[PDB]
Structures are given as structure tokens and as C-alpha cells.
């Protein structure tokens, strides 16, 4: 109600361009409204889009002014160039003013994902993963890593079976090129092994982890890959498929609060709780950086199992085992 008037006051153009229908959602990164997109609006400009290939309702994405121009521009350009088909959201236009901006992204009817999360047959989940993993393969063909994979990031509609990606601001690319032209008491260091107390004994010695490593850590907690959790300086592609595996573990388990973690160390402790800290230390070591979990309490091997086996055996955290998207597609999911 107040939304139409305030948006008209800020942007008089939309008052004549569109009559805003109503608001359909509020994101932590932007706002989403639904508008009746029938002005002249050439159907060619609004054609070849995942919805019905015509001219009809277009959601308006109000982007918060706080976001950086470079970030918003990368998003609005990867909408335009690298996403125009293959079950992806296309963008046709955008309205800009001195400060604030809106994107014009065709509306896709959907429903809340918490409604059908425990009363849906297996075949529906099969086709859901089919659609998601096809979109993932197209994204990797484009060469970008989504890096922010969560249920809201992919809108779905069961009535029409529609599925489209959204809330993907954290999409970025791999290095895409690698160049190798050539090739007793001393202090608090005594704490356990030397390495435990090297940090304390000296005055904030060095600072590499957050200064010269500084890696990348963006996304949602509880969906990160072990390499990201360990803050490694090199990750190639498999974070997305690890997140997909987390999603399928969530869907095989009928319980709404899958993870309550909100910290990196807490998430790592959760991963050690679910899977043996022995193999966690093995993976951390083989990644190229050390690991030491001396926590006495809660060290016994974790319950591993106490369709399920085949779905649970596809969680391999090192880059020498796991396969590609079509490889996961090859498993039977397409009965008739």
C-alpha cells in the first residue's frame, strides 16, 4: 500500500510505466515486487523466456543502494550475457536513478519450499534434482561458480514443474589459469605442541591467515565445502556439488532444523560430530595444511547410518574422486 506511493515518489517514471500489482517477497539482499508488465513492451523483447514465451507479469527487483556498484554491475551483466536460456532467469531491462536501481526480471509463480518438504514422492525429488543439476551443468559450461546454493536461491513451482535460479549474487569464477614458469621452555609455545602456542608466545606473530591467505569465505553457513571451511588458497569447482550433496542429505531427512550452526569453528565441530574427526584430520592434512583435534570428550566414531547407501556414498571431499553433473545424472532417475 505504502510501497506504491513511495516507489512513485522516488521514481515518477514507473508511475506511468507500470501499475505495481503487489509485493511477493522481501530478501536480505534486495526486495522483490510483482508488476503487471503490459505496456507496449515488444513481445520479441519478452520472448524466448522460460515462462510461456510472451509478454506478462514481470517481477521488479529493487536493489539496495548499499551494495557496491561493481557487485551490482557484475550481477546485472551476468544476468544479461551469460543467462538467456537453459532454465535460467533472463533480464530484459532495468530502471536506474541517481542512487537506487530496479531490475526487470519476468515473474515466475512458485510456492514456499517448507510446504512440500515432507509430503512429496521420490519421483518429484528426482525431477527436481534433474532440473537443478542440468542448470548446474549449464552454469559450469559458462565457467562460473554459484557459491551460494540454498533452497531460496532456486525458485520452484510444482503445478507447472517450473524451476529458475535466484539470489545468486555470490557467483564468481575460478582462477581459470595457473602459471608455473619455474617449478625446555621458550614461552607459551610450550602449550601442547609448539604450533599451539607460537601464536600466543609472540605478540600477534605474523598474521597470515586473514592477511596473506584471506582466501574467500562468502555464502550461507552450513553449506560450505571443507576446503572453504579450512580457508584454502585454491578451490576449483566442487563447492557447488558439495552443496548439492548437503541439499540431498537434507531432503532424505524429515526434520526442519538440519543445522543450527552460525560459526566456522562450530560448523567444523558439527562436521566432526557427523563424520569421524579422524577422517576430517586426514582430509585437512592432505589438503596441504595441518590439523589437530585433541578434544577428549566426544571422540568416539560417529554414527554413519544408524537407496540410502547409494545416496550417502556420494560425499567425497577431495578433488581426485568426485564426478561431474552429467555423471550424477546417469544414475537412474528418469522412469518413463
Amino acid at each position: 500500500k505504502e510501497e506504491m506511493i513511495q516507489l512513485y515518489h522516488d521514481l515518477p517514471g514507473i508511475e506511468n510505466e507500470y501499475k505495481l500489482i503487489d509485493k511477493i517477497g522481501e530478501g536480505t539482499f534486495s526486495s522483490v515486487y510483482k508488476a503487471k508488465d503490459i505496456t507496449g513492451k515488444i513481445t520479441k523483447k519478452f520472448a524466448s523466456h522460460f515462462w510461456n514465451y510472451g509478454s506478462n507479469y514481470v517481477a521488479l527487483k529493487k536493489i539496495y543502494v548499499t551494495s557496491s556498484p561493481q557487485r551490482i554491475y557484475n550481477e546485472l551483466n551476468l544476468l544479461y550475457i551469460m543467462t538467456g536460456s537453459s532454465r535460467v532467469a533472463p533480464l530484459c531491462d532495468a530502471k536506474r536513478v541517481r542512487d537506487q536501481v530496479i531490475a526487470v526480471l519476468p515473474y515466475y509463480p512458485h510456492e514456499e519450499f517448507r510446504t512440500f518438504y515432507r509430503d512429496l514422492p521420490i519421483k518429484g525429488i528426482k525431477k527436481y534434482i534433474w532440473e537443478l543439476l542440468r542448470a548446474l551443468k549449464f552454469v559450469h559450461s559458462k565457467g562460473i561458480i554459484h557459491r551460494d546454493i540454498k533452497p531460496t536461491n532456486f525458485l520452484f513451482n510444482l503445478e507447472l514443474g517450473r524451476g529458475v535460479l535466484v539470489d545468486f549474487g555470490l557467483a564468481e569464477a575460478q582462477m581459470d589459469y595457473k602459471s608455473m614458469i619455474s617449478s625446555i621452555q621458550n614461552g607459551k609455545v610450550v602449550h601442547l605442541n609448539n604450533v599451539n602456542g607460537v601464536d600466543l608466545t609472540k605478540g600477534y606473530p605474523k598474521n597470515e591467515t586473514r592477511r596473506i591467505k584471506r582466501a574467500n569465505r562468502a555464502g550461507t553457513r552450513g553449506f560450505r565445502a571443507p576446503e572453504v571451511l579450512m580457508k584454502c588458497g585454491a578451490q576449483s569447482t566442487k563447492i557447488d556439488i558439495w552443496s548439492v550433496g548437503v541439499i540431498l542429505l537434507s531432503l532424505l531427512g524429515r526434520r526442519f532444523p538440519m543445522f543450527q550452526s552460525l560459526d566456522d569453528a562450530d560448523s567444523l565441530l558439527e562436521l566432526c560430530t557427523i563424520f569421524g574427526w579422524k577422517e576430517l584430520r586426514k582430509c585437512a592434512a592432505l589438503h596441504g595444511l595441518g590439523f589437530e583435534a585433541s578434544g577428549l570428550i566426544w571422540d568416539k566414531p560417529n554414527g554413519y547410518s544408524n537407496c540410502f547407501q547409494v545416496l550417502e556414498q556420494c560425499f567425497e571431499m577431495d578433488p581426485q574422486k568426485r564426478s561431474s553433473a552429467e555423471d550424477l545424472l546417469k544414475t537412474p532417475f528418469f522412469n518413463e
Binding site: 604450533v195 565441530l269 577428549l296
Partner: protein
């Protein structure tokens, strides 16, 4: 007492701290708190402006700031999308 820390095989790279005791409050021995997930834990009883690199508490306050106003009238970064839109 027990604890956890990740580090570097060479230690040239600074480590990651997870000093944790399930009995934090006494840091000796206790049972009430827990750092790990509980299978049943529903709860049942049984901003920052990167455009102006300044902290704030309410959006409207930051708008009236002189720095924020100065950028608004400055229109030189809008060529990017306009170039693609016209294409």
C-alpha cells in the same frame, strides 16, 4: 584442559583457533552447555555502507550524510549497464 587448533605443517601460515571446552562456564568440568548439535533442538522446553565506507544504525540517517549525497549527483559509473541495455 582439552582444546582444538588447526595449523600449518610449516607453521609459516597462521593457525585457526577452536579452543573449546564443552564445559565452558567452569572451564574445568560441567554438563549444562553443549557445542555440538542436538538431534532434537527445535527450542521446545522439553548495517554497513560500502558505498560510503561508514557504519550506521538506520538507513534514513545515512542518506542525509554529505558523503552519500555527493555520490548521488556523481553519475560516471552508470555507463556499464546502459551499454549492455541498449544492445
Amino acid at each position: 584442559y582439552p582444546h582444538v587448533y588447526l595449523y600449518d605443517l610449516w607453521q609459516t601460515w597462521a593457525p585457526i583457533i577452536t579452543l573449546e571446552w564443552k564445559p565452558q562456564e567452569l572451564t574445568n568440568l560441567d554438563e549444562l552447555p553443549y557445542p555440538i548439535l542436538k538431534i532434537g533442538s527445535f527450542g521446545r522446553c522439553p548495517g554497513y555502507c560500502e558505498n560510503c565506507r561508514v557504519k550506521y544504525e538506520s538507513l534514513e540517517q545515512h542518506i542525509v550524510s554529505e558523503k552519500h549525497l555527493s555520490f548521488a549527483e556523481n553519475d560516471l559509473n552508470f555507463e556499464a549497464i546502459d551499454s549492455l541495455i541498449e544492445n
